[PDB]
Design a protein around this ligand. Structure first.
Ligand SMILES: [Cl-]
Length: 248
């Protein structure tokens, strides 16, 4: 496995490039060696292939997902209806539980980091393969206060993503980041009113996921037994049909 055997096609976007070998496409993220392994094979995690290290740079070869991220798809859709948001949130929750069972706290969950499989499924990344800094829309209250802080933070972020999937804008999103920090520490959740109202089960899930109390917050077991996820076949989730499929 040589690094020069990857014809760099297009830059994806701390930089990722679309490389090519024998017809196969790959997402190669570059990390400068100044900053600076273990395989995690899971249906809801971006599969990593190689970790080639050249002169003064380290290269990460991962599978290429043409579906993009969930933030862009959310901007196209404006917002997801309930069943799409619950499917996506379910898959992200299985990824989170797989990550916690391996001793990993994702610490940076957001729609930017959720990639879309060719069959419509969700794969997480930027959890240890790649990673204070704004935006603080997805940080838990215990993160702002500078305290410890365990894996429950990953679920708080989930409660944000859920809300963001259902309404369109994140709940604690506001003008300046200080105002956002206030909205988080005060837990001012701008519930939609009128005909755009959230269902009681959705409101319950967003409430139990966004609890200020670290030890009273929701986890994998809480969502499993939650009325919003009672239609979820957890033991066989990577074979459900997804509302959006990327092509070509
Ligand atoms: Cl968990």
């Amino acid at each position: 496995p040589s690094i020069e055997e990857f014809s760099i096609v297009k830059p994806i976007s701390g930089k990722v490039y679309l490389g090519q070998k024998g017809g196969k496409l790959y997402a190669v993220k570059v990390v400068k060696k100044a900053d600076m392994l273990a395989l995690s094979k899971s249906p809801f995690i971006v599969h990593l292939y190689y970790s080639l290290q050249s002169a003064n740079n380290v290269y990460l070869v991962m599978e290429y997902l043409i579906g993009g991220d969930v933030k862009s798809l959310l901007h196209i859709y404006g917002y997801f209806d309930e069943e799409m948001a619950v499917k996506y949130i379910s898959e992200v929750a299985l990824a989170l539980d797989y990550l916690h069972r391996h001793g990993i706290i994702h610490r940076d969950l957001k729609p930017d980091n959720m990639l879309i499989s060719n069959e419509g499924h969700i794969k997480l990344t930027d959890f240890g393969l790649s990673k204070f800094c704004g935006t603080p829309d997805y940080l838990a209250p215990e993160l702002l206060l500078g305290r410890a802080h365990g894996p429950a933070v990953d679920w708080w972020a989930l409660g944000v993503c859920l809300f963001e999937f259902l309404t369109g804008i994140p709940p604690f999103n506001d003008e300046t980041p200080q105002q956002v920090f206030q909205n988080i520490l005060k837990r001012d959740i701008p519930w939609p009113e009128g005909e755009e109202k959230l269902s009681d089960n959705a409101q319950s899930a967003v409430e139990i996921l966004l609890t200020i109390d670290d030890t009273k917050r929701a986890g994998m077991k809480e969502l499993k037994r939650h009325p919003l996820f009672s239609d979820v076949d957890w033991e066989n989730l990577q074979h459900q049909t997804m509302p959006f499929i990327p092509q070509p």
